[PDB]
């Protein structure tokens, strides 16, 4: 709950920015997220997670089609009740 | 999006928001380039070299000279100093 | 003259060539000595960086860069790695005897590794006021260890070597109130004596 200032890296996480754009990374735990100036989320995530990461942005398997797992494991057609 | 999503397959895109009439926004003194390097280099810095071999990203930037003073451009001359 | 001896005591500690141990925490990247300083060519640029270090713990692992000749041989682990091989192979040596990795360079230069943390960098008579860095300029001059990037004396270790830092856009660390307990040893009298 307390604010802080920025730049910020405690506990492995570094929470820079970057081209005008703000940054949060994490490479000892496998991912870098940012944000831009109009509001843009983006989870670049290592290949260490395969067929892992179950969540929002799917499952980091080579298929397209079934990552829509949901959180009990279920192919789910719809994309919102996701 | 879409400009990104091929950047990241290993197949990078240029100059395609010079005719596009849409810039991503940016605060004043930089706007957007493609492929500017991370590690800027900024005012109060150290000049070394040949550590920054990461892959290129995409962000505004300052202009050629113009370098980098807490969050907006300033011209290379009147770089100041710290105590 | 005799062969100086950087070392890094414990996790956010560093003792100069001339004699001067101070107090840094930080959790970026750090040139821990080099020689392109001012007006010279600048053969060697060791550097040091810490990651989750500020707070010494079981974690605070260090990583290392050297990079002399042109080369890019680094080190975390437990094992030390080659990322770009060196022209003049002739002087490169590898002597992992013990609980140390002893690994010279030249004819004026030599690091050691306990494999954990320390970092006791040996220099020569060779030098005598080339290099620059967390270590200072080995000079014998004892009290001019704090020379920052920006040519200026300074009176507060925490000030200085965020003016080393490689990276000038990560986070510079906080100047802490000084205090003779720290964290866990603040307001626990009892622990205070035991670690006594
Ligand atoms: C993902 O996990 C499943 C279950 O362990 C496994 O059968 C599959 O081979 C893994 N990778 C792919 C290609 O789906
Ligand atoms: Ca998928
Ligand atoms: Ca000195």
């Not at chain 2, 071999?53 to 770089?79: A, K, M, N, Y």
Request: glycine fraction near 8%; charged fraction near 20%.
């Amino acid at each position: 709950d307390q604010r802080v200032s920025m730049p910020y890296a405690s506990k492995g996480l570094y929470l820079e920015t970057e081209a005008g754009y703000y940054k949060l990374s994490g490479e000892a735990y496998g991912f870098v997220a940012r944000i831009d100036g109009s509001g843009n989320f983006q989870v670049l995530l290592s290949d260490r997670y395969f067929n892992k990461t179950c969540g929002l942005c799917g499952n980091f398997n080579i298929f397209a089609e079934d990552d829509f797992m949901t959180q009990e494991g279920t192919l789910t057609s719809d994309p919102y009740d996701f | 999006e879409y400009a990104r999503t091929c950047a990241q397959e290993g197949m990078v895109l240029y100059g395609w928001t010079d005719h596009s009439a849409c810039s991503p926004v940016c605060p004043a003194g930089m706007e957007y380039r493609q492929c500017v390097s991370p590690c800027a280099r900024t005012c109060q810095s150290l000049h070394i070299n040949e550590m920054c071999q990461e892959r290129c990203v995409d962000g505004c930037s300052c202009p050629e000279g113009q370098l980098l003073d807490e969050g907006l451009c300033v011209e290379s001359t009147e770089c100041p100093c710290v105590h | 003259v005799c062969d100086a001896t950087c070392s890094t005591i414990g996790m956010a500690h560093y003792l100069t060539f001339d004699g001067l141990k101070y107090l840094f925490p930080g959790e970026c990247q750090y040139v821990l000595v080099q020689d392109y300083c001012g007006s010279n060519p600048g053969t060697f640029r060791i550097l040091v960086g810490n990651k989750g270090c500020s707070h010494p713990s079981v974690k605070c692992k260090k990583r290392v860069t050297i990079l002399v000749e042109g080369g890019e041989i680094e080190l975390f682990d437990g094992e030390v790695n080659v990322k770009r091989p060196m022209k003049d192979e002739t002087h490169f040596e590898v002597v992992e005897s013990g609980r140390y990795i002893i690994l010279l360079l030249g004819k004026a230069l030599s690091v050691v590794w306990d494999r954990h943390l320390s970092i006791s960098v040996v220099l020569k008579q060779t030098y005598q006021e080339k290099v620059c860095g967390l270590c200072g300029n080995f000079d014998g001059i004892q009290n001019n260890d704090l020379t920052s990037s920006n040519l200026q004396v300074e009176e507060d270790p925490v000030d200085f070597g965020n003016s080393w830092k490689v990276s000038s856009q990560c986070a510079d660390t906080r100047k802490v109130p000084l205090d003779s307990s720290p964290a866990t040893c603040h307001n626990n009298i009892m622990k205070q004596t035991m670690v006594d």
